[PDB]
Amino acid sequence: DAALPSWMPGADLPGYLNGTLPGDFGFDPLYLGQDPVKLKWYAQAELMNARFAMLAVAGILVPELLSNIGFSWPGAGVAWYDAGKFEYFAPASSLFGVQMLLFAWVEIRRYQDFVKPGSANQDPIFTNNKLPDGNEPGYPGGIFDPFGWSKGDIKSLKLKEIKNGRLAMLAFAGFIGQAYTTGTTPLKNLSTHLADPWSTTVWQNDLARL
Amino acid sequence: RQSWLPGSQIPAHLDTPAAQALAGNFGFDPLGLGKDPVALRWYQQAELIHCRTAMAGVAGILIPGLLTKAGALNVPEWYDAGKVAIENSFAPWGSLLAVQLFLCGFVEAKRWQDIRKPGSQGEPGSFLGFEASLKGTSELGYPGGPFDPLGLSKEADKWADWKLKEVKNGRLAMLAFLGFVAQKYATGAGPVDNLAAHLKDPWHVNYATNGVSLPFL
Amino acid sequence: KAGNWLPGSDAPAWLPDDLPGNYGFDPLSLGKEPASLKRFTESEVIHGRWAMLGVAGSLAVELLGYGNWYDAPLWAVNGGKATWFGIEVPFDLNALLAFEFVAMAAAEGQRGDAGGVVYPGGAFDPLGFAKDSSKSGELKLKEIKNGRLAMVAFLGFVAQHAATGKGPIAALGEHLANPWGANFATNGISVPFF
Amino acid sequence: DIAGLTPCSESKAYAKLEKKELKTLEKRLKQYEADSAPAVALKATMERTKARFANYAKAGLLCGNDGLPHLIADPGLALKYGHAGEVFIPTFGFLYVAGYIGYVGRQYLIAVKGEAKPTDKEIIIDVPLATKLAWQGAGWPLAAVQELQRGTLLEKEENITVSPR
């Protein structure tokens, strides 16, 4: 209900989205963020899902990009969906248990800081090490930002982060869809489409299987 | 005011402030079984127990069944899991049922006494000091203490929402199990098999073509 | 207080500050009433002492080469004679249950008749290590912490045995030999999908 | 099995009776044509007789020395030898419908008793109220148990007239 950017110029956006959260464009046709507590939780959920999707898309696209060139390493021809049944130094079960314990520790710490901001900024072992007092949930800083990049325009950088995260989330969804339909890696699908985009579309490929 | 039938006359016994405090109040009572407040309270407890039991059972039927469709698990069908489980078991079904009846009767009798007198299970010097945690909250059917270890019921802002997510889901589960029985007597396969068979051809594989649900057609 | 189990959380008001091992850990509010807290405190100290004795016995019996803790009463299942430190004992299972029952009943009855005493002293402390009440609070914290660790260790003993089949000493050597290849995730029952 | 009886699927008198009924029907059919109304009706009766005998034998009924089915009324024997469909399930079915009718009638009487002329409503039935009560009577056992537990099902002794003894 202001001059803030909108996802539909002229549309009547809801009033609970006043631009406080980063990347607010008034996009909520299902009104899932009506409840303030639900919206507060969904903001953190969007941030976490966005960051994990960004790391995932980077970790899916980088090995395939380096595999298509002269760079070589042990796991090169293995696809992202085939990396699970790969021979590593430890079995998948052991790695899963180790990561479950480590993620349990960091996620409980993050949840503790979410329910009480500033209550988890202190290092339990080294009492001298701590995060700055000024902090918000989902934006830890301190050791997490050693370069001090947040000292500048925190609003523009947060907007860039949420936009890149939404794009990466859609990219991961597209990765799942392309792997389930074409049954081939995403960069190979991109190359196939770039060879002749007029005859290689979702409609043509899906109609050829109907 | 949400209603189960837009335009229908909501019963007066379901419009009182005490009845409106119950979760999932949609004014659905055509038979008028909840006219008596005591009967309404008893039926509310019965609905809560049915919701939780149906949710646990339907989850135990759907999740292992869905994992069996893939290569995650190999759990047999719900209508055949009892025989398979009792075959390679350490006890017959009768002895197991007797132990189960005793263990369930103890907790059900304690819950019954709490229904008859709320907070009566907190009688000092009666349950080895654990009686202090056996007192429920101000709402019947929603106890704390040992139950709810995460303490998600302490926040009132989401409390009214949480209960709405428990009854509704439970009601859905109550229907799910019912379908699980009807489908078993109409197709002879499991629920996941029926879902896949219907998804393969919904215009010809449904209850209108099973030859049982429509005997006149 | 001894510390904070959950950093950033406030300690419960029903837990006294002078209570040994008071980390403010009570999410279920079991010790909310003062009458229940006393019984639970005595029960926790007794459990810690019994667990310390049990874990020490299991570790010593498996380290001295006299089998593990699980195979100790197997002599009375297939016919045999119990041996303590390699010395034969002529007491059968029937005479052991009666003597242990009488001795434990008398000792526990005498202990319970005192009105729930956690720190009797006197005859139970002939060396006088806790004669002064100033250092009593520090040693009590060590006792409750070692007891809690022993309780956790005994639960781990039972769980790891039911999951693998070997004893605690044999499981430690296997894990030291292959840490990534031998753990709870590779037993086959802790993680079902993997 | 029970009481020295034999199952109808193995009784010789049962099959003999079926043959006798089919024989008299066929004898009556022998005097008509092959594509007429009495022939079709007799053939339909014969098919109904065969289906009835096969359905009674398939149900697991017990036949006596006369070849006729015998019902088991004891709940223990019926539930132990698979005879609950004879006298047990129909017992509860009748109890449900009978209590349904009685509860609907009682509710109608209590509803019209608080009006100006209850006798007028007794001779001229109020169709909307009767239909509403008839539809609401599906939960008659639960409602009856609740009325009995609250003490509103019965009337006090001081409010009921009696003779001078």
Count of residues making up chain D: 165
Q: Crossing angle for the helix pair A186-195 and A36-67, nearest 10 degrees?
A: 70
SS (H, E, C) chain B: CCCCCCCCCCCHHHCCHHHHCCCCCCCCCCCCCCCCHHHHHHHHHHHHHHHHHHHHHHHHHHHHHHHHHCCCCCCCCCCCHHHHHHHCCCCCHHHHHHHHHHHHHHHHHHHHHHHHCCCHHHCCCCCCCHHHHHCECCCCCCECCCCCCCCCCCCHHHHHHHHHHHHHHHHHHHHHHHHHHHHHCCCCCCHHHHHHHHHHCCCCCCCCCCCCCCCCC
Residue B161 sits at the chain A interface (C-beta within 8 Å): yes
Structural domain containing residue D77: 1-165
Answer for the pair A23, A159: CB distance below 8 angstroms, yes or no. Answer: yes
CATH number at residue D56: 1.10.8.110
Give Cβ neighbours of residue B76 (< 8 Å, ≥ 6 apart).
B68, B84
User: How many domains is chain D partitioned into structurally?
Assistant: 1
Interface of B with C in 48-107 (CB under 8 A): 72-73
Taking CA A75 as the corner, what is the angle to CA A71 and CA A78, rounded to the nearest 5 degrees?
110
Query: How many other CB atoms are found less than 10 A from the CB of residue A52?
Result: 14
Q: Which residues does residue D63 pair with via DSSP β-bridges, in sequence order?
A: D6, D69
* Closest alpha carbon to B32 in B19, B45, B21: B19
Please tell me which residue of chain C has the smallest CA distance to B146: C28
For chain C, the straight-line distance linking the first and the last C-alpha, in angstroms and rounded, comes to: 42
Interface contact flag, B32 D146, Cβ < 8 Å: no
**Which CATH number fits the domain A36-209, given the four candidates 2.60.40.420, 3.10.290.10, 1.10.3460.10, 3.40.50.150?**
1.10.3460.10
One DSSP character per residue, D28-89 reads HHTTS-SSSHHHHHHHHHHHHHHHHHHHHHHTT-EE-TTS-EE----HHHHHHTT-TTTTTH
In whole angstroms, how far apart are CA A36 and each of A15, A46, B6, B157? 12, 15, 29, 10
> Rounded distance, CA D99 to CA D137, Å?
9
Closest CA to C49 of C151, C119, C159: C151
Q: Could you tell me if C175 and C76 are in contact, meaning their C-beta atoms sit under 8 angstroms apart? A: no
Q: How far apart are CA C156 and CA B64, in angstroms?
A: 28
At C88 the three-state DSSP class reads strand
What one-character DSSP code corresponds to residue C86? T
Q: Which amino acid is at B41?
A: R
Tell me which residue of D15, D32, D35 sits closest to D23, measured CA to CA.
D15
Write a three-state SS string for D70-84: ECCCCHHHHHHCCCC
What is chain C's length? 194
Touching D (3+ Cβ pairs <8 A), the chains are B
Resolution of the experimental model in angstroms, please?
Answer: 17.1
**3-state class of C165 per DSSP?**
coil
Q: Is beta strand D69-70 parallel, antiparallel or unpaired with respect to C83-84?
A: unpaired
Which residues from chain C sit within 8 angstroms of residue A119, using beta carbons? 7-9
Residue C168: other Cβ atoms inside 10 A? 22
Q: How far apart are CA D144 and CA D136, in angstroms?
A: 13
Rounded CA-CA distance D52/C33 in Å is 73
Q: Do residues D103 and D137 touch, judged by C-beta distance below 8 A?
A: yes
Q: Which two tokens stand for residue B136?
A: 């429920």
- Chain C CB contacts of A130 below 8 Å: none
Q: CA B24, CA B18: separation in Å to the nearest integer?
A: 13
Rounded Cα–Cα distance for residues A36 and B158 (Å):
11
User: Nearest 10 degrees: CA dihedral of B194, B199, B201, B207?
Assistant: 40
Both tokens assigned to C50: 């019994």
Q: How far is CA A171 from CA A38, A142, A187, in A?
A: 26, 30, 12
Amino acid at the residue C86: G
For residue B109, give both structure tokens. 């009798």
Cα gap A158→A150, rounded to integer Å: 9
Cα R_g (chain C), whole angstroms: 21
Q: Which residues of D120-154 are buried (b: 16+ CB within 10 A; e: fewer)?
A: ebeeeebeeebebbeebbbbbeebeebbeeeeeee
* Crossing angle (nearest 10°) for helices B156-184 and B191-200: 80
- Measured distance CA(B46)–CA(B34) in Å, rounded: 12
Say whether D6 sits in a helix, a strand or coil.
Answer: strand
Which amino acid appears at position A24 of this protein?
D
| C-alpha span between B30 and B26 (Å, rounded) | 12
CA distance A189 to A200: 9
Task: Find, among A148, A149, A154, the residue nearest to A136 by Cα.
Answer: A154
How many Å lie between the alpha carbon of A203 and the closest alpha carbon of chain C? 37
Q: Closest by alpha carbon to C148, among C45, C26, C40, C37?
A: C45
Question: Method of determination?
Answer: cryo-EM
Chain A residues touching residue B161 (CB < 8 angstroms): 35
Query: How big is the CA angle at B167 (ends B164 and B168), to the nearest 5 degrees?
Result: 80
Angle at the Cα of B213 from the Cα atoms of B212 and B217, rounded to 5 degrees: 80
Which strands sit side by side in the sheet containing D62-63, from one edge to the other? Answer: D6-7, D62-63, D69-70
Contacts of D65 (CB under 8 A, 6+ apart): D13
* CA-based R_g, chain A, Å: 21
Q: What are the chain D neighbours of B30 within 8 Å (beta carbons)?
A: 135-136
| B148–chain A Cβ distance below 8 A for any pair | no
Element (H, E) at C84: strand C83-84
B180 in Cβ contact with B194 (< 8 Å): no
Q: Using CA atoms, how far apart are residues B103 and B128, in angstroms rounded to an integer?
A: 18
Question: b vs e for D20-30, b when ≥16 Cβ sit within 10 Å of the residue's Cβ?
Answer: ebeeebeeebe
Query: Taking CA B105 as the corner, what is the angle to CA B99 and CA B110, rounded to the nearest 5 degrees?
Result: 140
Tell me the DSSP string of A81-146.
TTSTT---SS-HHHHHHHHHHHHHHHHHHHHHHHHSTTSS-B-SS-SS-B--S--BTTB--GGG-T
Closest chain A residue by Cα to residue C10: A119
Cβ atoms A186, A60 nearer than 8 A: yes
Phi and psi based region of residue D61 (left: phi greater than 0; alpha: psi -120 to 50; beta: remaining): beta
Say which of A89, A120, A124 has its CB closest to residue C180.
A89
Query: What angle do the packed helices B37-69 and B156-184 form, to 10 degrees?
Result: 70
State the virtual CA torsion across B69, B74, B78, B83 in degrees, nearest 10. Answer: 150
Q: Which helix (H) or strand (E) holds D7?
A: strand D6-7
Breaks in chain A (C to N > 2.5 A) come right after: none
Q: Where are the domains of chain A?
A: 36-209
The region that residue B91 occupies, defined by phi over 0 for left and psi between -120 and 50 for alpha, beta otherwise, is beta
Q: Check: CB of residue B41 under 8 Å from CB of residue B140.
A: yes
**And the tokens for C71?**
């195979």
Q: Which two tokens stand for residue A122?
A: 């202190």
Domains in chain B with CATH codes = 12-200 (1.10.3460.10)
A145: which 2 tokens? 């930002």
* Rounded Cα–Cα distance for residues B61 and B76 (Å): 10
Give the count of beta carbons closer than 10 Å to the beta carbon of residue A154: 14
Q: Which residues pair with D7 in a beta bridge?
A: D62
Residues 146-165 of B with CB under 8 A from C: 146, 149-151
Tokens for A14? 């809801």
Distance, CA of B82 to CA of B85 (rounded, Å): 5
The tokens describing B58, both together, are 């339907």
Interchain touch B–C (≥3 Cβ pairs closer than 8 Å): yes
Residue at token pair 């507590």: A37
Listed residue (A209, A171, A207) closest to A189, CA to CA: A171
Residue recorded with tokens 């197997």? C74
Measured between CA atoms, how close is A4 to chain C, in angstroms? 37
